Amino acid sequence: EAGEFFMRAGSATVRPTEGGFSVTNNTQLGLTFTYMATDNIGVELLAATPFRHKIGTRATGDIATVHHLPPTLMAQWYFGDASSKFRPYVGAGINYTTFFDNGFNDHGKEAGLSDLSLKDSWGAAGQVGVDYLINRDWLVNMSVWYMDIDTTANYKLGGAQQHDSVRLDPWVFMFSAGYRFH
Template identity: 55%
Template sequence: MRTALLTAAVLSALAAPAMAHDAGDFIFRFGAATVAPNESSDVVADIGEFGIDSNTQLGLNFAYMVSDHFGVELLAATPFSHTVSLPGLGDIAKLKHLPPTLMAQYYFGNGNLRPYVGAGVNTTIFFDEKFTNDLDGALTDLSVDTSVGLAAQVGVDYQFGSNWLVNASVWYIDIGTDVDFKLAGDAVSISTDVDPWVYMVSLGYKF
């Protein structure tokens, strides 16, 4: 009788879904993150709008589970580098940025597969702005303002083993900035929306 009860208890425990994330867990994820701008801007010198290419870097995020279903996450990365172009002129500038993003998240389910959604705020800091084609000295003094905007996210974790997981996630980030420079000595400011989709595939560790 005791053996039968013990066997039943073990089988019941094995059949019960394991909670992939519990209140108090810290989760560290690292992988490839791609920023794909969905850009638009004011027309520049009657030529056209800015174009901004995509870039992939090492993405990092750190999450803390406030409860079994609610978490907070900070997105970080190595600096993204983008080339800026204009129609008919090709590449005219390069810049880098860091996009720290703080998210509040809700995780669905209670097993090893945990889809989630998130919303939060992003700060994008631009630096190392420089013209690569200054049109024989006509373009000078390039700078790009820091942006603060909202962000939304969907993602999914799949835990394997006791601590490891794989993750796929997508963000949409509202990035709006002013691109300031001088054109033939005259100050110009171009309102620019970057508004990228950010895609990340990563490996995670829970502790």
């Protein structure tokens, strides 16, 4: 497996962590590119199509929608050996998330909200997952990611109240199939 490069394609679902400031879960296309430093140490990049979340509270409901790209870079450790058909793994790394295409809905505007945007964020990331190596060519995968994503939302409330701290700190769940290149 040393020298190997494999790509996984599948669903990645982001579940943001905590009157009420709720944020919906969203599932998008997930892609990971990984390389084997050795038979156990791997280098992986997670990529995704942009995610879309709705924000809101109990009474009003949705008041805005937000999108972001959470590209993540990881150093990993695969258990077992190069011949194991079943290899769980763990990783630690750095995440970078950018928010874009953020706007309040009619309801947000009716309440006096406008000019919304969130500033970029960097943060620790951890992961545990499993690869089931079917052939020298294919595999199926599961993956659970944790990510430090702290930001601050900027917008005006009829006036200019443009600063609040948003903490997503989401878990990301990924299911995929992967191809191997030797």
